[PDB]
């Protein structure tokens, strides 16, 4: 449940994001550098549990959806659909900070 | 969590219910007298989880929609969208009984 490269290979995008989005590439730079606990906390926040399904994280078919422009509001989640609701933050540093704060609340 | 006042403050109503409907005010009297276990069972039944979101239960944006007339069927829910489907039961005691049976056996 730590192979986040397998997570990226199957992730799709919504709300205006594509795999070539600046925000999206910043995001994958961040989570690939996450620790093992931060990866599990991300899976719990986005999917509802830290356990990988059988077949690897690719079967989650995660979606990263842009839900707005730059803001101070934290990212939210839609666990039913494994969707991260991710505002288009103005920096990689802000994105990491807002994303970490959102997923460490548990 | 147990902050059901914040849940009531952001709840929306449809299908013929409003905040002034008799059964709606009876609903809130019932759940506000719920035990801590029954509150968590209600959240798990209505939202899919008993954990409070980041920002309290007010962020759930619960919807109570009218689902048919008086009946002995139980209330249902769409946990992917925090929607409570509630038939217009004939009394508060019946509503309490039907809602308790629904959340304890699911």
């Amino acid at each position: 449940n730590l192979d986040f490269q397998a997570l990226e290979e199957t992730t799709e995008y919504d709300g205006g994001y594509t795999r070539d989005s600046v925000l999206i590439r910043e995001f994958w730079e961040i989570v690939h550098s996450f620790t093992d606990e931060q990866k599990r906390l991300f899976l719990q926040f986005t999917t509802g549990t830290d356990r990988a399904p059988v077949g690897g994280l690719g079967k989650l078919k995660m979606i990263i959806a842009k839900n707005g422009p730059d803001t101070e509001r934290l990212p939210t989640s839609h666990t039913c659909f494994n969707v991260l609701l991710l505002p288009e933050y103005s920096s990689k540093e802000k994105l990491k900070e807002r994303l970490l704060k959102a997923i460490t609340y548990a | 969590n147990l902050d059901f006042q914040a849940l009531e403050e952001t709840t929306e109503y449809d299908g013929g219910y409003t905040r002034d409907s008799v059964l709606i005010r009876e609903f809130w009297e019932i759940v506000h007298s719920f035990t801590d276990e029954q509150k968590r069972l209600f959240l798990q039944f209505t939202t899919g989880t008993d954990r409070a979101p980041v920002g309290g239960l007010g962020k759930l944006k619960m919807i109570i929609a009218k689902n048919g007339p008086d009946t002995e069927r139980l209330p249902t829910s769409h946990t992917c969208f925090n929607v409570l489907l509630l038939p217009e039961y004939s009394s508060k005691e019946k509503l309490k009984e039907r809602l308790l049976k629904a959340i304890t056996y699911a």
Binding site: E12, G15, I63, A65, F81, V83 | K61, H78, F81
Partner: peptide, 14 residues
């Protein structure tokens, strides 16, 4: 049933 919104991923996984 947000099919309550116009998100394309709900229409893709419904």
């Amino acid at each position: 049933x947000x099919x309550x919104g116009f998100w394309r991923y709900v229409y893709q996984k419904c």
